[PDB]
Amino acid sequence: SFAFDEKAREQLSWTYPHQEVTQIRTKQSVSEIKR
Amino acid sequence: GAEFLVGRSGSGKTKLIINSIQDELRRAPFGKPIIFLVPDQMTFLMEYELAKTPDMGGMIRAQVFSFSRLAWRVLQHTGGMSRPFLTST
Amino acid sequence: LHSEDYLTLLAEHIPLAEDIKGAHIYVDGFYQFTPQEFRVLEQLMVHAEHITFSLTADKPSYEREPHELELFRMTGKTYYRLHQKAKELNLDITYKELSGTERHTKTPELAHLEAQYEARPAIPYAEKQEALTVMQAANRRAELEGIAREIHALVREKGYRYKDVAILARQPEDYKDMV
Amino acid sequence: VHRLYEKELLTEEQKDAIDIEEIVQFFHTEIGGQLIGAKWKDREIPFSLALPAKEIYPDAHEADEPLLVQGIIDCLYETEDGLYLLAYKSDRIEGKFQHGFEGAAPILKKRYETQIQLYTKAVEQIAKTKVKGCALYFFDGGHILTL
Numbered sequence: 001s002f003a004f005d006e007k008a009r010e011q012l013s014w015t016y017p018h019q020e021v022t023q024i025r026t027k028q029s030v031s032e033i034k035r
Numbered sequence: 036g037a038e039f040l041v042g043r044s045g046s047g048k049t050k051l052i053i054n055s056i057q058d059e060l061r062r063a064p065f066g067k068p069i070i071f072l073v074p075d076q077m078t079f080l081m082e083y084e085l086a087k088t089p090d091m092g093g094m095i096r097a098q099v100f101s102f103s104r105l106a107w108r109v110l111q112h113t114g115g116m117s118r119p120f121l122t123s124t
Numbered sequence: 125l126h127s128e129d130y131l132t133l134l135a136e137h138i139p140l141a142e143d144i145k146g147a148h149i150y151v152d153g154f155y156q157f158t159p160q161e162f163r164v165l166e167q168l169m170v171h172a173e174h175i176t177f178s179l180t181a182d183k184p185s186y187e188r189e190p191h192e193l194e195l196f197r198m199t200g201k202t203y204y205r206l207h208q209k210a211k212e213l214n215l216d217i218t219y220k221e222l223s224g225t226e227r228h229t230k231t232p233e234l235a236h237l238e239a240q241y242e243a244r245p246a247i248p249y250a251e252k253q254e255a256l257t258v259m260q261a262a263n264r265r266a267e268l269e270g271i272a273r274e275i276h277a278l279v280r281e282k283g284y285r286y287k288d289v290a291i292l293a294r295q296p297e298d299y300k301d302m303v
Numbered sequence: 304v305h306r307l308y309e310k311e312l313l314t315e316e317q318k319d320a321i322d323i324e325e326i327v328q329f330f331h332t333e334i335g336g337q338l339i340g341a342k343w344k345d346r347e348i349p350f351s352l353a354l355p356a357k358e359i360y361p362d363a364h365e366a367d368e369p370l371l372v373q374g375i376i377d378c379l380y381e382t383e384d385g386l387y388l389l390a391y392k393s394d395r396i397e398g399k400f401q402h403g404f405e406g407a408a409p410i411l412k413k414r415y416e417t418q419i420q421l422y423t424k425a426v427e428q429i430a431k432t433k434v435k436g437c438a439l440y441f442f443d444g445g446h447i448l449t450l
């Protein structure tokens with residue numbers, strides 16, 4: 001039972017909400033969408 | 036006619052222009068051409084921002100141009116693109 | 125065709141192109157223009173219907189160029205030249221100045237910094253510190269990892285997204301590989 | 304074309320290789336006839352379109368920004384009835400299909416269906432005017448596929 005046990009637990013299991021869209025290119029080609 | 040929009044950094048000039056163009060896209064989607072002239076490392080940003088309207092969600096009448104890209108389009112229309120060009124090397 | 129002959133060739137074909145004739149043109153983000161770009165600009169001033177020049181400056185004067193020690197030296201000079209040529213070609217000119225600050229309406233410290241940047245002597249800031257932080261690092265590695273932790277805090281706790289953050293350097297080569 | 308060659312819009316190398324008959328033929332067709340006899344008309348129309356990420360990628364979210372998809376529309380014309388889209392393809396048809404164009408027609412429609420749907424989505428969204436019909440003119444055989 002240390003003071004920061006809870007917070008540390010919270011941080012180490014944390015995952016970015018919008019993780020999935022961090023690699024998705026913004027600009028896309030009409031030809032590429034078909035691809 | 037000319038319009039000098041001037042203000043310190045944080046004045047809201049760019050958003051004012053973005054919104055101006057957006058409203059003008061609303062009024063007439065097929066109206067006379069609207070040219071957004073920005074530095075080459077700023078062309079995409081504005082393109083994105085203009086595209087972010089719930090109203091229209093894109094642009095057609097209004098394009099974002101660099102000096103170079105503008106040169107490309109006007110020259111595609113007027114001519115003189117035939118000659119090859121040389122990289123700095 | 126030399127790669128720098130595009131802007132020249134553009135300037136002498138603008139009167140020839142019809143699409144330009146009815147166009148509205150907005151220019152922004154620029155601090156200054158090369159003469160070769162200026163020729164294009166004035167040609168647009170002639171054959172386009174309307175054109176707006178957005179410049180970052182504080183009450184620039186079209187009568188004389190700024191003093192060299194002025195904060196808005198570049199933009200001021202640009203304004204002077206642009207206005208000069210506009211009057212030269214007898215354009216009907218409309219001026220709009222944005223007195224208010226819209227960017228830092230939410231945060232006081234940065235508005236104070238923006239407003240009191242150039243000011244001599246500078247007036248101190250008496251309120252609490254929250255949004256302006258000066259940080260000292262043991263090295264560049266520590267600087268980067270530090271900023272990494274701050275960014276992680278900013279996205280975990282302060283509801284910022286990664287896209288809201290920006291890291292600037294004067295000499296990026298000092299940092300990029302390590303970033 | 305030598306107005307174009309002179310103004311260097313096309314290199315003389317490009318000029319030398321052009322079927323003049325193939326170009327003229329489109330204008331004889333009824334859709335091309337509609338184009339010439341049009342209330343309004345515009346060509347080489349560039350566009351940018353925002354599309355929610357979810358459409359292109361599953362698991363994406365509305366807060367998550369739209370993707371930007373850009374393109375160039377070959378032709379757009381407005382008759383008294385409505386607004387129509389026009390595209391040209393230097394595709395090869397007559398040379399290699401068993402049913403010729405009729406073998407090509409289902410396949411060609413497939414080849415550009417996604418593209419056309421994106422183009423139409425663009426004009427539909429940005430100008431907020433539905434487009435009545437879309438036409439694909441193929442230089443090879445002078446065929447026009449309606450979509």
Ligand SMILES: Nc1ncnc2c1ncn2[C@@H]1O[C@H](COP(=O)(O)OP(=O)(O)NP(=O)(O)O)[C@@H](O)[C@H]1O
Nearest residue numbers: 042043044045046047048049050051180226227229
């Ligand atoms: N009316 C407004 N109210 C509040 N914030 C605004 C408003 N208009 C713009 N902003 C925000 O202000 C910030 C900067 O706006 P911007 O249009 O770049 O001003 P600016 O005059 O161009 N500053 P700068 O480009 O540095 O010279 C952005 O974060 C905008 O979202």
Ligand SMILES: [Mg+2]
Nearest residue numbers: 048049152153
């Ligand atoms: Mg700006």
